[PDB]
Each structure stands twice: as C-alpha cells, then as structure tokens.
Design a protein around this ligand. Structure first.
Ligand SMILES: *[C@@H]1O[C@H](CO)[C@@H](O[C@@H]2O[C@H](CO)[C@@H](O[C@@H]3O[C@H](CO)[C@@H](O)[C@H](O)[C@@H]3O)[C@H](O)[C@H]2NC(C)=O)[C@H](O)[C@H]1NC(C)=O
Ligand SMILES: *[C@@H]1O[C@H](CO)[C@@H](O)[C@H](O)[C@H]1NC(C)=O
Ligand SMILES: [Ca+2]
Lengths: 397, 387
C-alpha cells in the first residue's frame, strides 16, 4: 500500500411560509449582498473581506429612530426596510423596530452552544446634547446606548476600548484607536462570535496543501481535514459548490466555492437571497471527507463611503435631518465596522482542543476547498445572516 | 408534455421516446427478477427490432407495437411526422451507429429466424434489410448444423463474446427474434491498474461485501438530484459515448429511482451537470444476461404479435407468431474501458483533484451516444461480484 502515498498529491416566492422575523432577515440579507457588491469595489481583488451584516442592518435601524424626512427615507429604502413594511398592510415602521427588538434579544441573550455578542453604539461629542426620547428608544428596541463622548479625551478612548475588549473576550483591543479627535458623531459596529464545529477537524491532520490564488499561481496553506456528515450542493448556473459547516447550537457556515477563477466575480455579482434559498433547497446529506484551510480575518472598515455609493447621503451631511437625535446640526463622520473571525480545528474563536476520536470510518465523497471562496454564517431559526466574507488568500488576514 | 423536443434534432426526439419505452420495459423486467440480481439490456436493439418487425404487421397487431413502443407518441407529437418517419429515422440511426466509427466498435445483431417451411415474403425481406440492416433468415431449429452455424456466426460478430446465441431452443420453434448489441470502447479517463483494490460495497441496509474497486483521477461531469437523492457521474468513452452512473444515496432510494426514471429526469441531470477534476472509485463488473422479452412485452400490452390469430400478413402468407424474443448481451467494465483487450500503463492522471466520489453502493448505469442521444444500454449493478 505504498500506493496511497503515490496516489496522494502531497509533497413573493421566498416569503411563502416564512415567519415575520425570517422575512425581515430576507430583506436584511438582500441589503447585505448589495452592500458587499459595493464594498468589494473598494478593496483589492486579492484581499479578503469580512463583515457582520446583521450588525450593519441593526445599526441603521437604530440610527433611523432619530432621523426624519428624506434623510430617514434614503436609509429605509436602501436597507430595504421599505420593501418589508410594503409586503403587507399589517406592518409599519414601528414593526421593523419591534422585530429588530425581538431579534436582538433572541440573538444576543445567553444561548446554548455558542456566544453571540453585539456592539451597536452611537457616540456623540458632549457639546451636542442627545434628546432623551431617542436615548430611551435606542435602548428600548436595540438594547443599545447613545452615549455622550469626548474623542479628544484619552480617558474616553481608553474606556471604550477596554469595554469592547472585555465584551469581545479580548478579541478587539483597538476599537477607538487612530480616530480623528475632531469627530462629532460616530457609529461603532461589531459582532462577536464564538462557536464550535459540530464536525470538528482532528488536529494532527492539518497540513500544508496547495491553494490556488489565481489562474497562474498557487501557495501553501494550513489545510484542515476531517470526516463527517455535511449537507452540500452545486450550482450549475453559477458553477460553484456550496458546503454547509454546522456549529453547535443552530448556526452554520456556508462555504461557496466557484470552480473557475473568473467565477468569483459572477457569483459576487449574482448573490441574492433567492440564490441562497435555491442552494438550501437542493442540498443533500452525505458522509464527506472535508478539507478546509484555516484562516484568520481582521477587518476594520468605515462604511460611510459604501453607504454613500448605495444612495444614503443626507445622513452624512450636516444638512441632513436628525432632529430626532439632537436639536443641533450634526452628522455621522465615521461608521466604524470592525471584526475578527478565526477558523481552526475546534470552531470559531475557539479556545479548547478536542483530541478524542470521533470521525466515521469511511466517507462516500470528499471536497477540497483549494481555491477562493465566499462564506456565509446564518442562524437557522431566524434565517439571519450574521457574517459574510471572502477568502481570496487564507494566508493573509 | 414534449418541451424536451425543443432544440432536439429529429433523431434525438425519436431516441427520447425510445428511452421512454426503455424505462417502462425496465420497470416491467425488474419485477421478473430478484431485487438482488443485476440487470442488463440494450434498449436501442429492442426498439429497432420492434420497428423492423412492424414492417410486416397490420391492424391492431401493428397498433399494439407502435403504441407500447411509443412510436405513436412520436408521430402524434408533430404533424410533420408519420409512420414512415420512424423507419427513415431508424435507417439513418442504424447506419450512423453500426457503420465503422472512430474510437469504438458498435455492432448490431437484429435477426428474425423463420422455420424453412413457412416462406418469407421477399418484399418484407428487403424493406427489413433496407431500413434496419436486419436479416429475415430461413431457419431449421431441429438441424444442429443451423444452430451451430448461427452460434459461430454470432460468436465471430461479437468477437467471441456471445457463444450460445441459439443454444437450448425448442426445435418446434417457428419464428424468433435474436437481438444483441456488441460494444467495445475505451475510457477517456482510464484507471491506473495498480490502484485497483478490494473495497467494501454496500449490498443493502444489512450487508456489505468486498469487491474489486478501481481508482482514478480525471475530469468528469457529475450532477446531484435532490428529489431522488442520487448522484450522477458521467464516464466518457472515446468517440462521443458515455456511461452515466446513477447512485441513490439510500437503499430505499433504488426502488424510487427505478420507479421514477424517465427521459425528463435524465434531461434534468444533464442540464445540472458540472465539470470537476475528481478522484473516482468504481467497482469493476461483468454482466452476462439473456432474457426472453415475450412475457415483458405481453405485460406491457403487446399480445397479438405473440399469437397465431395475429396479423403477420406482411411477413408471411401462413399462420405464424413470434415464439420467442431473445435479447442477450454482455458488458465488462475494467480499467481500460468496456470489452477492452488492451492495457494502458503510461502515466496520465492529473496531479490533483478537488473532489472524490466512491461508488460503494447499488447503482444503475445508462450508456448514451451523444450525437443522437441514443440510449444504447442500461443496467443495474446490485452486486458487482455477481454476473
Ligand atoms: C445527515 O444524516 C445523518 C445520518 O447518516 C445524520 O446523523 C445522525 O443524526 C441522528 C440525529 O442526531 C442520530 O440518530 C439519533 O441519535 C440519538 C442519540 O445519538 C438517538 O436517541 C435517536 O434515536 C437517533 O438514533 C445519528 O446518530 C446520526 N448519525 C448517524 C447514525 O448517521 C445527520 O444528523 C444528518 N444531518 C443533517 C440532516 O443535517
Ligand atoms: C472539463 O475540463 C477539462 C479541462 O480542464 C476539459 O478537457 C473537459 O472537456 C471538461 N469537461 C467536459 C466538457 O467534458
Ligand atoms: Ca492534502
């Protein structure tokens, strides 16, 4: 059997039947992919991407509690909150907020199997007062806080960073670092996720395996390898494979791998809630040997320009209308969205190691993630898109 | 209904109805055998044999055949088509398939044997030849010289594959149809011979057996069927012919797939297929089947053709009915291809594969000729270690 060494290559349609929350999340997902479409054009084609959609949508829903007129409407049409209140006459703007309140309590309250935490705050220079009505509704429907701030006082910068560092179990340590002290109003958005794989990867099987970066160049990456039951699907139209990795607790990661290098662009341009639904319904259960590169993404963006490209402009102009937030003229200077995701043999943001034996003895198929791929992290019960990212190069952050 | 036809050529449309008959015949034939037995038939041969025979039938006798063979669905599918369209199409198909071809050998044995007592109308004899390359021959099932001559002739034709074509046949036989399709092809993606090894193969929910499993790498098209929960792998032969491997995920899946298989289903698989570089494990096997399709054809609805009170007026002047419809065939699948006699040892596998697919459980296989969409063969491998 020296052959195994030689053979080896080593060395509405959608809304039908969906709960009210799921519908909202279908719209939030639609926005997310549109946002991604815009974000991707602001980064190199060879860079990885990582964002937490539910965090962005929740930040916009919250901020809008204090917006009015066109300013408010640009935000609601583009976030697609409109499409929702329109889906039926039994809804309304307040419905969006109540639904978001339920989602937030449901997602960010102690849960079994994983840790989901949200940082959704608004910081406003102490010179501009914050209307109490806005302050309580934010805390009421989003459990968030509109805090008074002082971007020129290192005591404020320091306090916030430590808060976020604790909240994210030491993951995010520089939330408000390198921020212009002349800032008047900013949004800090960050979702923290810690979970473990239903099908873990035995640590001794991780090894160097070739990963294709583009049509003509490959690199070595730490490749994890495991066996187990996984749902998977193929998309003939977009020519890509979709593998579903389950975390304990009702949360999964969809690994979307386009067969061709020129396929990524098409997939990114085509990705919508319907496409995802299509993949979900054509999924099948199989015993699979799965090879996945481990990776760690550390991203930090300012979404103001992306939101501007999509059509939300008044909210970023002192001439916009935020009479619901302050009686004084202000506007968002920075919409900071930061987050990290570490994928290893145990799960995500894992701190434990599992050495016991647990793989099935044989597997009918195998799928090797050896080329650029997109990943989507969903919460099953609510069909909520928590995270989304592109891994163009697993050896880069 | 027939939205399948959209885009298809005229020969393809006929071969679609031909395939429809094939799956119905399969459905009927599988109930005449054991759930654990393997099955192997050559659909194209059966359809062409029935088309030929029909040139000599009339009335309800003729109607049953064109009906159960779905020849009726074909003409009834376009005002442009008529009964002679079937025959014109079969002559073109027969010539394209059984004439010298590149990459593979495809030979046909479509004969009708009639006791020498009953004469054969010369008219029917020529049309049979002119449209199906069929031979309405004179016979003597009591003279061993005849049996022997026929056996040696088929043995030569099938390159030594079929040796007992007319063995164990009732001498009192008056008229019969001998039907075989000989095929020899080589894989586009062969299997390295040293990689073949014993591998566990699922026979059913309860038992597993060891079989000779081949292992290779290469580019293959494959699809996934969520409704039937089956995987479909396409194995290309040199020359535009391919074997489709249909593996239901669950044991109980075989029954459903066999019950649901239709031209539309296959069409769906084809449209959903993608190309990948895969590691493919496939068990080698050898099917040797010999059936008398009379019973099956009767169960399907063709009865007059098999009774003296039938109308075979165009074949002969005297009263005669088909006594036996013999369909015999053999298929061997190895590292080189099918019915191969050569061995390839040169290196040829790609260096890496993105996916792997192990055929470790019961499966069905369909062999199609791409240009004409002709279903040459179809079978069931319930146990690769059985014939
Ligand atoms: C994909 O299909 C596999 C089946 O091959 C599913 O795995 C099986 O999941 C069930 C449910 O968790 C397990 O069976 C149950 O086990 C519990 C205790 O372990 C027992 O109390 C129940 O009566 C039942 O037997 C099973 O162990 C597990 N593995 C097996 C036997 O295959 C898997 O959940 C499916 N994944 C999907 C549909 O997402
Ligand atoms: C799969 O791709 C290979 C080249 O990568 C090509 O030779 C083959 O024809 C493709 N599959 C098809 C269409 O048979
Ligand atoms: Ca490897």
């Amino acid at each position: 059997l020296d052959l195994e060494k030689i053979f080896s290559e080593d060395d509405l349609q959608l809304f039908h039947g969906k709960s009210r929350i799921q519908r909202l999340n279908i719209l939030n997902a639609k926005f997310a992919f549109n946002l991604y479409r815009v974000l991707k054009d602001q980064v190199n084609t060879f860079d990885n991407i990582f964002i937490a959609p539910v965090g962005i949508s929740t930040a916009m829903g919250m901020i809008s509690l204090g917006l009015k007129g066109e300013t408010h409407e640009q935000v609601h049409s583009i976030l697609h909150f409109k499409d929702f209140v329109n889906a039926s006459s039994k809804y309304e703007i307040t419905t969006i907020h109540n639904l978001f309140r339920k989602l937030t309590h449901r997602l960010f309250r102690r849960n079994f199997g994983y840790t989901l935490r949200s940082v959704n705050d608004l910081y406003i220079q102490k010179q501009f007062p914050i209307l109490l009505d806005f302050k309580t509704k934010v805390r009421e429907y989003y459990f968030a806080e509109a805090q008074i701030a002082d971007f020129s006082d290192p005591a404020f910068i320091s306090k916030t960073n430590n808060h976020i560092m604790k909240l994210t179990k030491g993951l995010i340590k520089d939330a408000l670092e390198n921020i212009d002290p002349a800032t008047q109003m900013m949004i800090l958005n960050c979702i923290y996720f810690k979970g473990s794989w239903v099908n873990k990867f035995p640590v001794e099987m991780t090894h160097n395996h070739n990963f294709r970066l583009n049509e003509r160049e490959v690199v070595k990456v730490s490749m994890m390898q495991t066996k187990g039951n996984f749902l998977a699907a193929n998309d003939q139209e977009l020519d890509c494979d979709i593998l579903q990795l389950e975390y304990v607790g009702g949360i999964s990661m969809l690994i979307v791998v386009p067969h061709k290098m020129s396929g990524m662009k098409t997939l990114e341009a085509q990705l919508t809630p319907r496409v995802v639904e299509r993949w979900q319904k054509s999924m099948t259960n199989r015993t699979r040997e799965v090879l996945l590169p481990k990776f760690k993404l550390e991203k930090n963006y300012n979404l103001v320009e992306s939101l501007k490209l999509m059509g939300i402009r008044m909210l970023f102009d002192k001439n916009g209308n935020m009479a619901g937030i302050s009686d004084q003229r202000i506007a968002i200077d920075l919409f900071k969205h930061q987050g990290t995701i570490t994928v290893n043999e145990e799960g995500t943001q894992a701190t434990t190691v599992t050495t016991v034996g647990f793989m099935p003895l044989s597997t009918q198929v195998r799928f090797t993630v050896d080329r650029p791929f997109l990943f989507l992290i969903y919460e099953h019960r609510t069909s909520c898109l928590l995270f989304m990212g592109r891994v163009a190069n697993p050896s880069r952050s």
